[PDB]
Amino acid sequence: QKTPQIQVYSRHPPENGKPNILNCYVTQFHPPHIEIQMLKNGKKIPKVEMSDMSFSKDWSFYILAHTEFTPTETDTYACRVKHASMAEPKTVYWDRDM
Amino acid sequence: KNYTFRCLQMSSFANRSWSRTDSVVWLGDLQTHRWSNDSATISFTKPWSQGKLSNQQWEKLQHMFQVYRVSFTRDIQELVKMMSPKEDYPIEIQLSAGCEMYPGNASESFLHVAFQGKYVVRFWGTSWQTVPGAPSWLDLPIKVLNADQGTSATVQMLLNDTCPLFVRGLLEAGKSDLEKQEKPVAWLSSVPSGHRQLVCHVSGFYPKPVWVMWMRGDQEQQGTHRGDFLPNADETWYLQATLDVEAGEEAGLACRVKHSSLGGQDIILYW
Ligand SMILES: CCCCCCCC/C=C\CCCCCCCCCCCCCC(=O)N[C@@H](COP(=O)([O-])OCC[N+](C)(C)C)[C@H](O)/C=C/CCCCCCCCCCCCC
Ligand SMILES: *[C@@H]1O[C@H](CO)[C@@H](O[C@@H]2O[C@H](CO)[C@@H](O)[C@H](O)[C@H]2NC(C)=O)[C@H](O)[C@H]1NC(C)=O
Ligand SMILES: *[C@@H]1O[C@H](CO)[C@@H](O)[C@H](O)[C@H]1NC(C)=O
Ligand SMILES: *[C@@H]1O[C@H](CO)[C@@H](O)[C@H](O)[C@H]1NC(C)=O
């Protein structure tokens, strides 16, 4: 059993009011069964695209989730993951102004 | 130059009546195929995913894989049945097969198998073999498998002939994608950890190789910490390089980015 790592990053330089894409890249986990949510101000984002699941040279799995978003000054984004390796869901917040 | 072609199979067995097998295929870092469990046919993820194979050649190849997928699932469920309660459910099996292409017309092929996240079995030369330290209960089933000369011959054909043949065709047909150049866009921010961590973000570049460094004038800052290559969803890359800096020492720092797409014209951003 292996714990997922999570990295959250935007496709383009974040500009408030400008359409962009936020990525949540989830890696190093096993077994391959996993639930990934992207969050806007603590609420699940409905339209989130998932890449096909794949795996690395060390056999650990990875997958990319992404969603279209327009950054504002006050909106906060996160990626929350549920996996059998963890008793509690793991949440990582988008860094921008942290 | 060097290209690795990887067929990646992911099979999950939760119990007697629940299994799924999904596959993806990669040429270098570009996905060429996807084969979902709930699809009868292999799906193309590029215009050129059929390479230089004729429709008939592809159909023959696909049918073999279709037969294989059903056969593999039956064989494993039967292996588990005759393995109670040595190693029971859930069971994860992964298979990684393909060939690495080298300058000239040379290549080396591979077929590796992992059980519960651990490498246990390879096909090598003319036979399946367990790797040193693999569970001993695998010995007899691998010997049984090795008695199937039909499967052995087919695997030999696939690794020795079919793989490099198919990949040569992919490399010709996929040339404009494989040799594409996408320009990085960079930006600077900071995050916590008085010290601050300065961040140089580099995004949207292709191909993968890239040089990112924090600089004070001509001096490379050896505190520069490069992260991992992270994929964007549009077949480009993302990387960041950080530098932890004392408060009031930020002035004079720059991030320099070198990339093949920029033709010698580095991006330089100033903090
Ligand atoms: C490989 C590169 C070729 C280029 C093609 C590129 C296109 C790729 C597109 C999608 C690919 C999908 C990914 C598939 C992965 C490749 C797998 C290759 C194997 C092909 C074999 C075909 C023959 C066949 O299907 N063999 C099976 C069926 O045989 P059969 O008697 O039913 O008849 C088949 C037809 N034949 C011509 C007579 C052989 C046979 O039963 C072994 C199946 C099991 C083999 C895997 C065992 C591995 C050991 C795991 C044990 C450890 C786990 C522990 C268990 C508890
Ligand atoms: C596929 O290639 C392998 C070599 O990579 C061949 O395996 C060799 O086979 C001969 C006799 O069959 C053995 O004496 C060698 O020891 C094998 N080499 C290795 C490295 O194990 C195999 O014969 C080839 N199969 C086909 C159909 O061409
Ligand atoms: C087998 O596993 C699947 C997937 O977890 C589950 O939905 C199903 O209920 C299980 N079946 C039995 C008979 O336990
Ligand atoms: C996967 O595909 C097989 C073969 O068609 C099917 O029987 C099985 O129910 C599928 N698994 C899941 C979890 O849907």
Structural key phrases:
heterodimer, A: 98 residues, mainly beta, Immunoglobulin-like, 5-stranded antiparallel beta sheet, 4-stranded antiparallel beta sheet, B: 271 residues, alpha+beta, Murine Class I Major Histocompatibility Complex, H2-DB, Chain A, domain 1, 2 domains, 8-stranded antiparallel beta sheet, binds sphingomyelin, binds a molecule of 2 linked components (NAG-NAG), binds 2-acetamido-2-deoxy-beta-D-glucopyranose, protein homodimerization activity (chain A)
Explained architecture:
Chain A: GO terms for molecular function: protein homodimerization activity; structural molecule activity. Chain A: Belongs to the beta-2-microglobulin family. Chain A: This is Beta-2-microglobulin. Chain A: It comes from Mus musculus. Chain A: It is found in: Secreted. Chain B: One of its GO terms (cellular component) is lysosomal membrane. Chain A is mostly beta strands and 98 residues long. Chain A has a single domain, classed as Immunoglobulins (Immunoglobulin-like, Sandwich), CATH 2.60.40.10. Chain A has strands at residues 5-10, 20-29, 34-40, 43-44, 49-50, 54-55, 61-69, 77-83, 90-93. In chain A, strands 1, 2, 5, 6 and 7 form a 5-stranded antiparallel β-sheet that branches. In chain A, strands 4-3-8-9 form a 4-stranded antiparallel β-sheet, with no helix packed on it. The radius of gyration of chain A is 14 Å and the shape is elongated. The termini of chain A are far apart. In chain A, 31% of the residues are buried. Chain B has 4 helices and 17 strands. With 271 residues, chain B is α+β, with helices and mostly antiparallel strands. Chain B is elongated and about 70 Å long. Chain B has 2 domains: 1-179, Murine Class I Major Histocompatibility Complex, H2-DB, Chain A, domain 1; 180-271, Immunoglobulin-like, CATH 2.60.40.10. The interface between A and B is medium-sized, with 29 and 32 residues. Sphingomyelin binds next to β1, β2, β3, α1 and β5 of chain B. One 2-acetamido-2-deoxy-beta-D-glucopyranose binds next to β1 of chain B.
